[PDB]
């Protein structure tokens, strides 16, 4: 089989995890999607000349059992850490997602991309510079997206695969 990348989208409720995932997989923006549904999706894509399979988990936070959270975190190879630019709390939560994923995987070297979503909205509480400072501290890429206009979406997910490939080659 062609190579498959297991990607996990994490972040506070309401930040756009579902909207981003459906934009990438189905190329449309969804106004409402039950905030409690946690599904995964497959899409074949070409990234820098490589035909590959993306397997993306759109997380919904708590699980029936905490062992399930641990299971997706060990299985997933890269993590999109999403906040919304209009939700300071979602940005603060990023510290906790960072910590947890590293701690389940028992690794200092986990492919992640920091994503500030809803960039189309006028309302902003999190400035670009503050998110840049965070990403610099983590040594990972940062991208601002709009699930609504699709701006930065393929960049966010393809950048994550690129981080995974850097990780593999060590």
Ligand X SMILES: Nc1nc2c(ncn2[C@@H]2O[C@H](COP(=O)(O)OP(=O)(O)O)[C@@H](O)[C@H]2O)c(=O)[nH]1
Ligand Y SMILES: OC1CCN(C(=S)c2c[nH]c3ccccc23)CC1
**Closest approach of Cβ 16 to Mg ion, in Å?**
8
Select 71 or 130, whichever has its Cβ closest to ligand Y.
71
8-state DSSP, 77 = S
Select 51 or 75, whichever has its Cβ closest to ligand Y.
75
In angstroms, the CA 99 to CA 89 distance is 16
Q: Based on the number of CB atoms within 10 Å of its own CB, is 83 exposed (0-12), middle (13-18) or buried (19 or more)?
A: buried
In angstroms, the CA 83 to CA 67 distance is 24
> By CB under 6 A, is residue 76 in contact with ligand Y?
yes
Q: Which does 110 bind (CB under 5 to 8 A by kind): ligand Y, ligand X, Mg ion, none?
A: none
The encoded tokens of residue 120 equal 């189309």
Q: Which does 14 bind (CB under 5 to 8 A by kind): Mg ion, ligand Y, ligand X, none?
A: ligand X
8-state DSSP, 149 = T
Q: Which three-class secondary structure state does DSSP give residue 154?
A: helix
In angstroms, the CA 113 to CA 77 distance is 12
What is the pattern of x (binds ligand X, CB under 6 A) and - over residues 121-150?
x------------------------xxx--
Q: Which does 71 bind (CB under 5 to 8 A by kind): ligand X, Mg ion, ligand Y, none?
A: ligand Y
Instruction: Please work out the total of residues on this chain that contact ligand Y, with binding judged by CB under 6 A.
Output: 11
- Binding residues (CB under 6 A) for ligand X: these are 11, 13-19, 31-33, 35, 117-118, 120-121, 146-148
């Amino acid at each position: 089989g062609m190579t498959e990348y297991k990607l996990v989208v994490v972040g506070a409720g309401g930040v756009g995890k579902s909207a981003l995932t459906i934009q990438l997989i189905q190329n449309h923006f969804v106004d409402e999607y039950d905030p409690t549904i946690e599904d995964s999706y497959r899409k074949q894509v070409v990234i820098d000349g490589e035909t590959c399979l993306l397997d993306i988990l759109d997380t919904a936070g708590q699980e029936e059992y905490s062992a399930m959270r641990d299971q997706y975190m060990r299985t997933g190879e890269g993590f999109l850490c999403v906040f919304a630019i209009n939700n300071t709390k979602s940005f603060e939560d990023i510290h906790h997602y960072r910590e947890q994923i590293k701690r389940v995987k028992d690794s200092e070297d986990v492919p992640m991309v920091l994503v500030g979503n809803k960039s189309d909205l006028p309302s902003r509480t999190v400035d670009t510079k503050q998110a840049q400072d965070l990403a610099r501290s983590y040594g990972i890429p940062f991208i601002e997206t709009s699930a609504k206009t699709r701006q930065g979406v393929d960049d966010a997910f393809y950048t994550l695969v690129r981080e995974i490939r850097k990780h593999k080659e060590k």
